[PDB]
Amino acid sequence: TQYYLKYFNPEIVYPKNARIMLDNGDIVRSTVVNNTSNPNVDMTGWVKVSSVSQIFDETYNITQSVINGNLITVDNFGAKGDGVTDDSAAFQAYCDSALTGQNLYLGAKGRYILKNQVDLKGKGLVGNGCGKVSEFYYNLGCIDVDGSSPDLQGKTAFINCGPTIQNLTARCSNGAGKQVSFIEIDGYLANIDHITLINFYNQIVVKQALVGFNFTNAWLYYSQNAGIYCEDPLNRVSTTGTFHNIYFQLGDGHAMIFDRDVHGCDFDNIIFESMNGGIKARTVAHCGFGKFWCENLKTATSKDWLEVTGANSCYGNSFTGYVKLLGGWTSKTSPTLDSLPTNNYGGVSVSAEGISIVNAGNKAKMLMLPSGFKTGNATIDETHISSSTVTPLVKRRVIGADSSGAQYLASDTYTKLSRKWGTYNHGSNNAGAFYAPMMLTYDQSFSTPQNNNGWKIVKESTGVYRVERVSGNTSVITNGHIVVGSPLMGSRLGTGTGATHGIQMIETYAGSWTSYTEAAGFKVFWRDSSNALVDPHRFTVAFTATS
Amino acid sequence: TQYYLKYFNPEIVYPKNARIMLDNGDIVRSTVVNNTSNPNVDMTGWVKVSSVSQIFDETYNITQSVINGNLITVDNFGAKGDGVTDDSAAFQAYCDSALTGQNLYLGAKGRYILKNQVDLKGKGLVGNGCGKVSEFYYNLGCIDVDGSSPDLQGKTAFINCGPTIQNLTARCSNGAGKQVSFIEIDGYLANIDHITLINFYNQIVVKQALVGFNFTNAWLYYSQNAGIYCEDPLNRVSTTGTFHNIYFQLGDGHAMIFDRDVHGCDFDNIIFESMNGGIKARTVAHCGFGKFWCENLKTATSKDWLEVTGANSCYGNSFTGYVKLLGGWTSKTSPTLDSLPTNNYGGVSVSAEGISIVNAGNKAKMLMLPSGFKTGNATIDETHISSSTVTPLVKRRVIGADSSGAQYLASDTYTKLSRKWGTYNHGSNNAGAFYAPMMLTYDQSFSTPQNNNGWKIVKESTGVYRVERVSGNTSVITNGHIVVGSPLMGSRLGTGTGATHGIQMIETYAGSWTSYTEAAGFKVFWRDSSNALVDPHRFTVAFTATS
Amino acid sequence: TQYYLKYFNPEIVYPKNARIMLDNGDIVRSTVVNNTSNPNVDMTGWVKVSSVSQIFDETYNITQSVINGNLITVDNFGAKGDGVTDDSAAFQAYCDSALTGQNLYLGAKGRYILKNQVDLKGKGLVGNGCGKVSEFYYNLGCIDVDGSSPDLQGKTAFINCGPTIQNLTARCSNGAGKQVSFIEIDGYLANIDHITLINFYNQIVVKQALVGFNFTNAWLYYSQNAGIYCEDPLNRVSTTGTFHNIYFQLGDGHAMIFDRDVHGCDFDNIIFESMNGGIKARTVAHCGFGKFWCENLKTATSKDWLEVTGANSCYGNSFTGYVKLLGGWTSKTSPTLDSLPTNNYGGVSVSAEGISIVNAGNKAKMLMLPSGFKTGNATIDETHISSSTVTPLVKRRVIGADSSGAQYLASDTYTKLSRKWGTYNHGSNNAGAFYAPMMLTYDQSFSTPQNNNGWKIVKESTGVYRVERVSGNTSVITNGHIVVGSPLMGSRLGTGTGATHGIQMIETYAGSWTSYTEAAGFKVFWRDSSNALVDPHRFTVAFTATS
């Protein structure tokens, strides 16, 4: 009478809305008229008044039950996040539930211990913060995998991850030597961002091959084998993966290991600090590499920041950010690196160190520096972009000023028949040129006549020599310059006696020279001091095929 | 007596804190003394005890009502997310509510059907996960627009979106041919990231023009017209938009369509897989393009990855990532592409294919490859960076080693008056040089005298010729080398007779040559075998203006 | 009898599950048998039935108390977010609470006023949306710092921020001239993304130095001093910071100020609109700079987009995006900028403007444009990539077509002893060449003999001259070409008389020339018209050391 408490009584008929207590003390309300059912064994016709399905938010005129569908976490399934209790069953219940969405979520605060593998069943993973690598952040929010658990030895803690890993701090405690990896995620369609992973054997285990795989803003500390590992067991070939803003620190192994081939992937703003390896792959093809900061090795003495193991399997790449190398890191991608005859890390390299380009399987490499150019094969080509164009080139070079004081660029000539360098006199307004003539020498001791460009010198008769076209030479001299050189008389060594020359042109057709200054060649006539025709043993001529 | 149930009684005075039931069975509590008001018609002086305003979390000493303000979603407004029920009214109620924040949020799990257009009223859109393109993820969390709804035909499903679209999966079901687009968002200030969009006509409809518009990490599948469409009807000109990590797959149209002009935008790590078009725009100016992976076309046979329609309207760009082309995709931006006289896709292009630079409206293009250089206009210039500097250049080239075994780079000379290539003898420690002299020919059959660089040859008298400066030529010979060539006697063809020459310098001032080896020119004297002066018809001289 | 209300009565023994009212009207339930304790003064053995610890979600069989641990915000601690009430104490309570996780969170809707500094105690900051810069978004969700509050003058509103700032809109109201800054965050390990900051003195205050610091997608408007400020008081040197997708608008000062040194940082897709300064630092070393859009200055007339104050302290950089300059912005990094002898902004610069490379402390700079090349020091070098290789180079140049119509690239020669340019006659199938010979002049008026490449000319006897090797010249002539020039007789000016020459080779060993065409040099013999030996005053020779 002085308090409220009534248990079920089988003699009573409970009207609609009547309230009594279950034997455990919880109040139930009848939802039907003439209720004679015992709510302790049969809840038909009754509801528990302390249930959120019976509590309403008047602002929305909906039950608290509905509002509790806004955000569901592992806490809903009994996870404690208390740094001690194994929450693996709660995590699994979440992933097996009909009520949960695309991703698994952690509660606001908790250090969630996992002593058994969790099958995410295709759900992604969203944590409760991306923290620094310190106990302060682990205590506020993280997944803490128990690496000492026998059931996790040699296994990955999370399998069948969906396309999301984000906003997460996750560590492995007491797993040294137990080969506990963190998470398995498929290579096709992933967004991984804002994560901090601490310890583990492999931190990110990629299944199958990359394609549309995006990875950014990750602090990956103390991995024992790799920060990111992609086996690609079926050799699908990884493509179109992006890896940005990743800090790899104090790992016993590599930053990234691809057992096989990587194509069209992008790597930028990556840090290797005290690792024992950088990025390792069998093949790296048509990938982009931006800025890398490589500082110190954990126990190794020397390591390449990028390690490609296949012969001529590093090609088509863009090494277009500066790679900082400190404390033992080396590079096979620097613009200033000398080329090899084969097995170069093929690609374009652009940084303050230089602008260069090289292919994997050839010695050719060009490098531009502030001073000019360097070549890897002792050769520099100059030609047309079009492979079909067969005109000569003209090079223009600043040599002075015109009368107004503007730069004067002079033009050269390099054809099959002419080598010249232009000039100009702005005082008198006359073009000019410097000449590299054809030179050609007759020597009666030669086994075969010397030939320059289809011309040879032959003796016609005593004292008369033809500088003549050989069979097939249809080229001509047009208004050319002619210089005859010095005679060696009497023998190849020469007696020291002299001779006087004159010339006569050889026409291509009657009147070709007289009228049009076209010639096939020319004759040289040699005479002694008595004006008699004489035969030198050897003499030179120099001539041009144009004016 | 054996249960608890009391309805309102008008004869009773209810004290403060008294509890009774409303006619519907819900308990009310009196908040005032002497309460005689019927709570069924007048709740003044009463509160409903099952309301969250009357439920407390003792940890915080606040009502559940306050806690329910932490996260509000469309579920608060009656959205079912059940794959059947039209939730459009609930979505609209959310956007019209005084209680909701910057963005619209989905509940934890739900496939939210929309059969009518939703006006976001400036709210952004945050989903419940960025999933793969599969029913598994649609069933867990997405917006599912009913493309068969007559009220959505030819319209956009969401209008007036705020500056956020994120963490979202959205599809259009049964909308083939109905031209249903997904969302309209203003071009000024946007962050779009971690989205998956499936079907629709235009997936992202940008209103007005881009500026400060950031778009990343998007899987855009099966669009019928475009993944991203920007009309820019007022021709404001789009600027400063970023488009990164986008996978366009199996669209019937283009990846991106700009009807007008795009300036200063960045595109990187984009995939076109089985599309019918890449990025199309009227003008593309000063944009950055990084890595593209273009593989296969849906029904088209050949498409450019970047399609710019305006004449000379592609200029100032950076094509600085590798563009992979497979299955019909083409490019107008490759470093190795030959230049056109006009309508080039103007910009710098850098990849393993080459390093090149070209302007839109000119044939000039330079390309650096491992082998050396290629030009698009048969010309290569060498000059100063400064347009006012008018000194000559010096080229240095490795030609051997010095006595210590270090590389010896020799210097050339190319001035208005001298062309030489330096050398050095490290055995005797003497500099040397190779010479390209001026050559100049006299021919009495010429209509006008030949002139080289302000010098011509004229007959002074029988057998005496001046190699002399013409009016305005104030340049000089300093300690030069002189070679006289071969005479053609008697006629232009030549008789074949010879002659003997000597020279005499022409001074610039009295003693200039004798004392300072400066000359204006020189005379050539020709004599026959009897030492009498004679006149050749034609002869050559070669000389240098410096030693 | 006609309502439910019973207060505590000390004469009564309350059984387990008995319910009565506290004096305030709240119902309590006995949890123990034989309960005689007054719940108004002693809650042992009682529980409040309206507490969320006594409310259950039957879907999960957990209390609402547990569900309320899923998301905790400042609203849990009494924050009103009403645009008037100071919520600083509530924010501080959140950060001091044992219940909260890594980050501080805002409620769904609220304009949260702060009139006092909040110490985040190492917690990061997560807002309720990243809005546009307008009252519409401030009213829906932001932090609104009261800049008129005396307690905030000259201070930062938030101190000791954790590694996260995201999804946030924050403004300072009425703070003009009060030097109120927004937030202090440590430089080591940060993820800042999707923020909008309005007003403040310094918006982001970085403590210590950058390392693993990632900053993206930020709209930073109206700062009075800087958008981002890093003092680095201990000169630790900032490294490995990324700054992407940042819109700086209408700031009275700079976008970013580093008082000291920055290494290995990346800046990309940044906008300066009506600022009074861009990025300022003492040292910028090995940093990457991508696309910048710089449009207009607030009150300044001219500002560099990048301002590095230290002498030769801008070096090693990559300026590899286009920098748009409008309305007064200038640049010291353009590829077309002329080099200085010192204090260049050192690095590689790549854009549609050109491809260039320069060092800080030297005049050297190379630039490639569509036309060819430009140099900053009037010099262009061509050498090997290897510093130890001492072979000559060969340049190949397109000069025509072969008989099949394919491009023919001809090879040059430039050794210590030979300068030639190759050619080929495809009509007759003969190689050819153009020659730049050594030239060397004898002059009896010279104070010392002229020397070219270890050869000089000396008089042996009347009319006999040796073109001979000097001591140490062990180089040889092999099958060379020889041309003797024109004699100046009788005096340096010349009388005009002539002479006739012949030559004789000088062997290196007996038979060297006769048998193997090897010579040390050659003799020149000069004779008058009566065939008597005579001595010219001066004469030239031209010769080659190879055929």
Side-chain angles (χ1 to χ4, degrees), chain B residues 113-294:
Chain B
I113 305 302
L114 295 172
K115 302 188 183 181
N116 294 282
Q117 182 178 76
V118 173
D119 187 345
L120 287 165
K121 305 294 190 77
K123 297 192 188 291
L125 183 53
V126 180
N128 55 9
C130 175
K132 302 184 191 167
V133 181
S134 71
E135 295 292 329
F136 177 85
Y137 294 101
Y138 311 154
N139 286 337
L140 292 175
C142 77
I143 292 171
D144 189 342
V145 178
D146 183 4
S148 77
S149 178
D151 297 309
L152 285 167
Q153 183 165 9
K155 293 180 191 160
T156 315
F158 284 97
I159 61 170
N160 298 321
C161 186
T164 303
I165 308 172
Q166 65 174 226
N167 188 45
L168 176 66
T169 307
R171 64 172 288 94
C172 185
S173 297
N174 303 120
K178 303 299 191 180
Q179 297 196 16
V180 182
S181 293
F182 176 53
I183 194 153
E184 293 180 13
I185 185 171
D186 194 71
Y188 177 50
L189 304 188
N191 289 304
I192 297 171
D193 59 281
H194 299 266
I195 66 171
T196 302
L197 304 180
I198 310 93
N199 303 317
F200 297 101
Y201 186 73
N202 294 317
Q203 286 170 331
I204 301 291
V205 179
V206 180
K207 304 298 285 181
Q208 299 306 312
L210 307 181
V211 37
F213 187 96
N214 302 303
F215 193 104
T216 196
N217 291 58
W219 303 324
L220 302 180
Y221 280 47
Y222 319 144
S223 61
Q224 296 133 20
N225 188 62
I228 304 168
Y229 173 52
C230 179
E231 182 184 9
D232 191 10
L234 304 180
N235 193 41
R236 303 181 91 96
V237 183
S238 288
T239 74
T240 58
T242 65
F243 297 93
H244 297 158
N245 303 164
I246 311 170
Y247 201 158
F248 299 93
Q249 188 177 132
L250 281 165
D252 303 313
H254 283 72
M256 304 183 69
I257 301 172
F258 294 91
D259 286 347
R260 298 180 170 77
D261 302 350
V262 187
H263 285 57
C265 293
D266 195 53
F267 304 83
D268 203 0
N269 297 311
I270 288 172
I271 308 167
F272 302 152
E273 186 173 328
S274 301
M275 300 293 295
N276 277 333
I279 293 161
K280 184 181 179 177
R282 187 173 69 184
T283 299
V284 175
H286 303 290
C287 290
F289 296 91
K291 297 187 67 56
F292 280 70
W293 188 279
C294 313

Side-chain angles (χ1 to χ4, degrees), chain A residues 51 73 137 221 386 414 416 441, chain C residues 58 70 122 188 401 407 422 481:
Chain A
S51 293
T73 79
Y137 293 102
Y221 279 48
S386 170
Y414 191 173
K416 279 183 166 173
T441 289
Chain C
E58 295 195 54
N70 287 342
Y188 178 50
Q407 290 179 352
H481 304 288

Side-chain angles (χ1 to χ4, degrees), chain C residues 204-277:
Chain C
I204 301 290
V205 178
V206 180
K207 305 300 285 182
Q208 299 307 311
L210 307 181
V211 38
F213 188 96
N214 301 305
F215 193 105
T216 196
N217 291 58
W219 303 324
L220 302 181
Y221 280 47
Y222 320 145
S223 63
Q224 294 133 21
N225 189 60
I228 304 166
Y229 173 53
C230 179
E231 185 185 5
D232 190 10
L234 304 179
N235 193 40
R236 302 182 92 97
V237 184
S238 289
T239 74
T240 58
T242 65
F243 297 93
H244 297 160
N245 302 343
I246 312 171
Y247 201 157
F248 299 93
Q249 189 176 134
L250 282 164
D252 301 314
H254 284 72
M256 304 183 70
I257 300 171
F258 295 91
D259 286 347
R260 298 181 169 76
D261 303 349
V262 185
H263 285 57
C265 292
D266 196 52
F267 305 82
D268 201 2
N269 300 130
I270 289 173
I271 308 165
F272 302 152
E273 185 173 326
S274 299
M275 301 292 296
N276 278 334

Side-chain angles (χ1 to χ4, degrees), chain A residues 1-5 7 24-27 50-52 64 68 71-73 75-76 99 108-109 129-132 136-137 140-141 169 194 217 219 221 245 247 249 269 271 291 293 322 336 338 351-352 354-355 365 368-376 378-384 386-387 389-390 393 395 412 414-419 421 436-439 441 446 450-454 470-473 485-488 492-500 529 538 540, chain C residues 4-6 12 14-20 29 54-60 62 64 66-67 69-71 98-102 121-122 162-164 188-191 193 211 214 240 242 244 264-266 286 288 316-317 348 355 357 359 364-366 373 380-386 393-401 405 407 410 421-428 430-435 479-484 500-505 507 513-514 517 525 527 531:
Chain A
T1 182
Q2 304 312 314
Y3 53 82
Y4 301 114
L5 179 60
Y7 295 115
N24 65 23
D26 297 353
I27 290 176
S50 70
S51 293
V52 298
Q64 186 64 43
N68 288 351
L71 173 63
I72 304 163
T73 79
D75 296 1
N76 283 252
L99 305 159
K109 184 199 166 69
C130 175
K132 302 184 191 168
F136 177 84
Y137 293 102
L140 293 175
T169 307
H194 298 263
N217 286 240
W219 302 325
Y221 279 48
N245 304 163
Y247 201 157
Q249 188 170 318
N269 299 129
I271 308 167
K291 297 187 67 57
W293 188 278
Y322 186 75
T336 58
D338 195 13
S351 77
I355 300 152
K365 182 170 184 181
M368 189 165 89
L369 291 164
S371 62
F373 304 102
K374 300 189 176 183
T375 174
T379 314
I380 301 174
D381 291 0
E382 298 171 333
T383 189
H384 306 285
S386 170
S387 62
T389 302
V390 292
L393 304 183
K395 293 192 73 176
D412 85 345
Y414 191 173
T415 71
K416 279 183 166 173
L417 294 171
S418 181
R419 189 73 176 102
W421 295 266
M438 287 180 279
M439 301 189 85
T441 289
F446 284 154
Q450 192 179 94
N451 185 303
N452 186 344
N453 208 12
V470 305
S471 181
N473 177 12
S486 310
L488 288 155
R492 208 186 205 169
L493 189 80
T495 56
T497 69
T500 299
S529 58
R538 173 174 176 118
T540 296
Chain C
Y4 301 115
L5 178 61
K6 287 289 169 178
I12 303 299
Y14 300 95
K16 189 173 181 176
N17 305 318
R19 304 200 181 194
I20 56 167
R29 166 183 175 171
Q54 295 294 317
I55 299 288
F56 287 80
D57 194 325
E58 295 195 54
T59 299
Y60 306 101
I62 65 185
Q64 185 64 44
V66 173
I67 291 169
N70 287 342
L71 173 65
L99 302 159
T100 51
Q102 287 197 20
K121 305 294 190 78
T164 302
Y188 178 50
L189 305 188
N191 291 123
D193 62 282
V211 38
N214 301 305
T240 58
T242 65
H244 297 160
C265 292
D266 196 52
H286 302 292
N317 298 298
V348 64
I355 300 149
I357 188 164
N359 292 120
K365 180 170 186 182
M366 281 303 300
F373 304 101
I380 301 173
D381 291 1
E382 298 172 334
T383 191
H384 306 284
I385 294 171
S386 168
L393 303 184
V394 172
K395 293 192 75 177
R396 305 200 303 165
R397 177 163 158 181
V398 65
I399 64 166
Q407 290 179 352
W421 295 266
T423 183
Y424 197 90
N425 193 317
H426 288 97
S428 59
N430 295 294
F434 307 112
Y435 295 74
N479 197 22
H481 304 288
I482 301 171
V483 174
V484 170
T500 299
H501 55 85
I503 54 163
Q504 181 182 76
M505 305 308 293
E507 298 197 302
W513 179 257
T514 299
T517 60
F525 294 73
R527 297 178 185 83
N531 206 38

Side-chain angles (χ1 to χ4, degrees), chain A residues 500-504 525 527 531, chain B residues 487-490 494-499 528:
Chain A
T500 299
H501 54 85
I503 53 163
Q504 182 182 74
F525 294 72
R527 297 179 185 82
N531 206 40
Chain B
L488 289 155
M489 303 300 294
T495 57
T497 69
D528 62 25

Side-chain angles (χ1 to χ4, degrees), chain B residues 157-461:
Chain B
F158 284 97
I159 61 170
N160 298 321
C161 186
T164 303
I165 308 172
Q166 65 174 226
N167 188 45
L168 176 66
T169 307
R171 64 172 288 94
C172 185
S173 297
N174 303 120
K178 303 299 191 180
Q179 297 196 16
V180 182
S181 293
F182 176 53
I183 194 153
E184 293 180 13
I185 185 171
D186 194 71
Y188 177 50
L189 304 188
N191 289 304
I192 297 171
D193 59 281
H194 299 266
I195 66 171
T196 302
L197 304 180
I198 310 93
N199 303 317
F200 297 101
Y201 186 73
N202 294 317
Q203 286 170 331
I204 301 291
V205 179
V206 180
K207 304 298 285 181
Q208 299 306 312
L210 307 181
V211 37
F213 187 96
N214 302 303
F215 193 104
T216 196
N217 291 58
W219 303 324
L220 302 180
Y221 280 47
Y222 319 144
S223 61
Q224 296 133 20
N225 188 62
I228 304 168
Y229 173 52
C230 179
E231 182 184 9
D232 191 10
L234 304 180
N235 193 41
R236 303 181 91 96
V237 183
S238 288
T239 74
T240 58
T242 65
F243 297 93
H244 297 158
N245 303 164
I246 311 170
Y247 201 158
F248 299 93
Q249 188 177 132
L250 281 165
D252 303 313
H254 283 72
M256 304 183 69
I257 301 172
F258 294 91
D259 286 347
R260 298 180 170 77
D261 302 350
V262 187
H263 285 57
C265 293
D266 195 53
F267 304 83
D268 203 0
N269 297 311
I270 288 172
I271 308 167
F272 302 152
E273 186 173 328
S274 301
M275 300 293 295
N276 277 333
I279 293 161
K280 184 181 179 177
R282 187 173 69 184
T283 299
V284 175
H286 303 290
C287 290
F289 296 91
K291 297 187 67 56
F292 280 70
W293 188 279
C294 313
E295 184 168 5
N296 304 146
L297 299 162
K298 198 168 186 182
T299 60
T301 58
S302 192
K303 290 297 297 183
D304 284 322
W305 72 273
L306 178 66
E307 177 178 356
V308 188
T309 66
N312 283 339
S313 300
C314 183
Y315 63 89
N317 299 298
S318 301
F319 308 114
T320 54
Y322 186 75
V323 177
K324 184 73 175 183
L325 302 168
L326 294 166
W329 291 98
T330 55
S331 175
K332 286 180 164 57
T333 65
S334 176
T336 57
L337 187 70
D338 195 13
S339 57
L340 305 168
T342 197
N343 286 328
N344 298 298
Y345 280 35
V348 63
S349 192
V350 179
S351 79
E353 299 183 302
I355 301 151
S356 73
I357 188 164
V358 68
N359 293 121
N362 193 276
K363 192 72 172 71
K365 180 170 184 181
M366 281 303 300
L367 166 61
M368 189 167 89
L369 291 165
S371 63
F373 304 103
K374 300 187 176 182
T375 175
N377 70 181
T379 313
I380 300 173
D381 291 0
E382 297 171 334
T383 189
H384 306 284
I385 295 171
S386 168
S387 63
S388 64
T389 302
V390 293
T391 56
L393 303 183
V394 171
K395 292 191 75 177
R396 305 201 302 164
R397 178 163 158 180
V398 63
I399 63 167
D402 66 22
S403 295
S404 76
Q407 291 179 348
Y408 177 70
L409 275 62
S411 293
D412 84 346
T413 302
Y414 191 173
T415 71
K416 279 183 167 173
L417 294 171
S418 181
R419 189 72 176 103
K420 295 168 64 175
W421 295 265
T423 184
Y424 198 90
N425 194 317
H426 288 95
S428 60
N429 299 308
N430 295 295
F434 307 112
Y435 295 74
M438 287 181 280
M439 301 188 86
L440 179 59
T441 289
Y442 169 84
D443 185 345
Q444 69 185 66
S445 289
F446 284 154
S447 303
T448 62
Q450 192 179 95
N451 184 303
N452 186 343
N453 209 12
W455 281 269
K456 66 174 177 177
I457 309 181
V458 298
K459 181 179 173 184
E460 175 170 286
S461 63

